[PDB]
Amino acid sequence: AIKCVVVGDGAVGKTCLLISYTTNAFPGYIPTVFDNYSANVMKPVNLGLWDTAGQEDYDRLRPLSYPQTDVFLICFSLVSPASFENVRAKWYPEVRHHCPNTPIILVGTKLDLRDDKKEKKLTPITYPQGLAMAKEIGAVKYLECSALTQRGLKTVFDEAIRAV
Amino acid sequence: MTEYDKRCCCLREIQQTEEKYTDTLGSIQQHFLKPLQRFLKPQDIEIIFINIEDLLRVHTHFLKEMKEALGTPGAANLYQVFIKYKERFLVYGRYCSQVESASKHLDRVAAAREDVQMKLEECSQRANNGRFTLRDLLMVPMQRVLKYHLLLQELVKHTQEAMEKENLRLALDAMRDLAQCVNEVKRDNETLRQITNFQLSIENLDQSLAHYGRPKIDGELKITSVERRSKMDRYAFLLDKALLICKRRGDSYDLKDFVNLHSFQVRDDDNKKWSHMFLLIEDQGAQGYELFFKTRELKKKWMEQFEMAISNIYPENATANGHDFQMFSFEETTSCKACQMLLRGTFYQGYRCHRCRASAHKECLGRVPPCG
Ligand SMILES: [Zn+2]
Ligand SMILES: [Zn+2]
């Protein structure tokens, strides 16, 4: 077994990363629901993935996903700010507290929309911006990717395993 | 892909995930509960499986409803399956407030009885070819109840109308409302956990602490009264309706003075420690206390808590438009007479009018229609 939980601000696209990866293709209509996924990947590991979509606003229901978790992918959108902040103030406080010993990959999502059309006086989480955070909250590894391109997408799930 | 194509890809999504959901529930009943009957005693099964059988009943009827609605109409009465089932779904309140201890109990029986541990492996092979443990399965309903809002959210943003969309948007609010009641049944569960601890240790105590609402802060202070007017080291519990002044040693706490917040008011006034003080004063009489704290920070926390307590006892608009609103614990499923969403939780969810008997959230009091 290996329990891996994908957590962070809604829309960034958790559901999607998970469906990109497991489905091995982008679908978009992009489904809302992603069932708990129990899989074999390659060294043969039994890999479990958990979406946390729809749990984000309900502070007493949401940490019910954290027990016996082997590793946490915390995510922000590389094209938000809104999210990147909440990593420091909400998600890391909560993971650390609920699970003092479980490691954390920090995942920057949407490297593809990273390079695109600042009206709102803001900037995309860049690679230094990211790792400064990763470092600040004691990450095990920092990554980036998109669900569309699937670039680095395969790296994330190899590193989540590596850490376990 | 149109918006219309998109709209019709997720009415499918609603149906297939719901199908899969009732399937899982069926699986938990059939490949798990019924076999384990058989090894385990009633108590232990009651404990592990919570109200899962009932969830199964609720959702199969609901799947029927959903099917007919989606298939028979041109999808138009969908909103109304959701609205109709909202309050029957509060049963998730108990599931989510009991699932951690259902999980823990399973572990324990598991470790105590390896014939049970074997059967468990047997069971999840029979059921999902060993891909999911019974523990895993037990988190599923919590996941599911918190997805209806996102589904209808999605079905809203590819919805064609006016009128179709509004009552989908209604159906969304019913589902976000439910999620929130469920978030608060759990918070209240554990708030009540913490009160029970306050009760058990310890007591010269004659009523259930629950009667004075929710804990605010508790800790060590020295105190003066009119009757006794040198500094006494004490341990105090602040709840919404009362301060419990205790004497303080061990795990034992001895109740030595009980203050009713209804009748008291906070008035304030070295950076040498224990210098930092405010007063609680009676209005129609003559009791009064000086509360001393080790530290300005400690003052300062306690005052805010005192102010939150009294604001709960005596909120903005407790007397608007005729009413006389009181902190109340509703023991029956109840909605707000202004906003019409639910009062959330199992414990002091909001306010009742001592004259109307009307029910309302703290934030909705000025908006309640006038009474008679
Ligand atoms: Zn009234
Ligand atoms: Zn209200």
UniProtKB/Swiss-Prot annotation, chain A:
EC numbers: 3.6.5.2
GO MF annotations in UniProt: enzyme binding; G protein activity; GTP binding; GTP-dependent protein binding; GTPase activity; protein kinase binding; protein-containing complex binding; Rho GDP-dissociation inhibitor binding
Gene Ontology terms describing biological process: actin cytoskeleton organization; actin filament organization; actin filament polymerization; anatomical structure arrangement; anatomical structure morphogenesis; angiotensin-activated signaling pathway involved in heart process; auditory receptor cell morphogenesis; cell adhesion
Subcellular location: Cell membrane; Melanosome; Cytoplasm; Cell projection, Lamellipodium
Modified residues ((Microbial infection) O-AMP-threonine): 32
Phenotype upon changing residue 65 to A: Loss of AKT-mediated phosphorylation and FBXL19-induced polyubiquitination
UniProt superkingdom: Eukaryota
Result of altering residue 58 to D: In MRD48; increased substrate adhesion-dependent cell spreading; constitutively active
CC annotations in GO: cell cortex; cell projection; cytoplasm; cytoplasmic ribonucleoprotein granule; cytoplasmic vesicle; cytoskeleton; cytosol; dendrite
Keywords of this entry: Cell membrane, Cell projection, Cytoplasm, Disease variant, Glycoprotein, GTP-binding, Hydrolase, Intellectual disability, Isopeptide bond, Lipoprotein, Membrane, Methylation, Nucleotide-binding, Nucleus, Palmitate, Phosphoprotein, Prenylation, Synapse, Ubl conjugation
Recorded consequence of changing residue 55 to L: Constitutively active. Interacts with PARD6 proteins. Interacts with PPP5C, activates its phosphatase activity and translocates PPP5C to the plasma membrane. No effect on interaction with RAPH1. Interacts with CYRIB
Topology within the bilayer: Lipid-anchor
Function: Plasma membrane-associated small GTPase which cycles between active GTP-bound and inactive GDP-bound states. In its active state, binds to a variety of effector proteins to regulate cellular responses such as secretory processes, phagocytosis of apoptotic cells, epithelial cell polarization, neurons adhesion, migration and differentiation, and growth-factor induced formation of membrane ruffles. Rac1 p21/rho GDI heterodimer is the active component of the cytosolic factor sigma 1, which is involved in stimulation of the NADPH oxidase activity in macrophages.
PANTHER family cross-referenced by the UniProt entry: RHO FAMILY GTPASE (PTHR24072)
Protein name: Ras-related C3 botulinum toxin substrate 1
Lineage, broadest ranks: Eukaryota, Metazoa, Chordata, Craniata, Vertebrata
Swiss-Prot record, chain B:
Domain (PH) ranges: 214-311
Tissue spec: Widely expressed in hematopoietic cells but not in other cell types.
Superkingdom of this protein's organism: Eukaryota
Residue ranges covered by zinc fingers (Phorbol-ester/DAG-type): 322-371
Annotated DH domain residues: 6-185
Post-translational modification: Phosphorylated on tyrosine residues by HCK in response to IFNG and bacterial lipopolysaccharide (LPS). Phosphorylated by FYN.
Function per UniProt: Couples tyrosine kinase signals with the activation of the Rho/Rac GTPases, thus leading to cell differentiation and/or proliferation.
Subunit: Interacts with SHB. Interacts with SH2B2, GRB2, GRB3, DOCK2, SLA, TEC and ZNF655/VIK. Interacts with SIAH2; without leading to its degradation. Associates with BLNK, PLCG1, GRB2 and NCK1 in a B-cell antigen receptor-dependent fashion. Interacts with CBLB; which inhibits tyrosine phosphorylation and down-regulates activity. May interact with CCPG1. Interacts with CLNK. Interacts with THEMIS2. Interacts with NEK3 and this interaction is prolactin-dependent. Interacts with ITK. Interacts with PTK2B/PYK2. Interacts with HCK. Interacts with PTK2B/PYK2. Interacts (via SH2 domain) with SYK.
Domain notes: The DH domain is involved in interaction with CCPG1.
Other comments on record: 'Vav' stands for the sixth letter of the Hebrew alphabet.
Protein name, UniProt field: Proto-oncogene vav
Residues of the full protein shown: 189 to 565 of 845
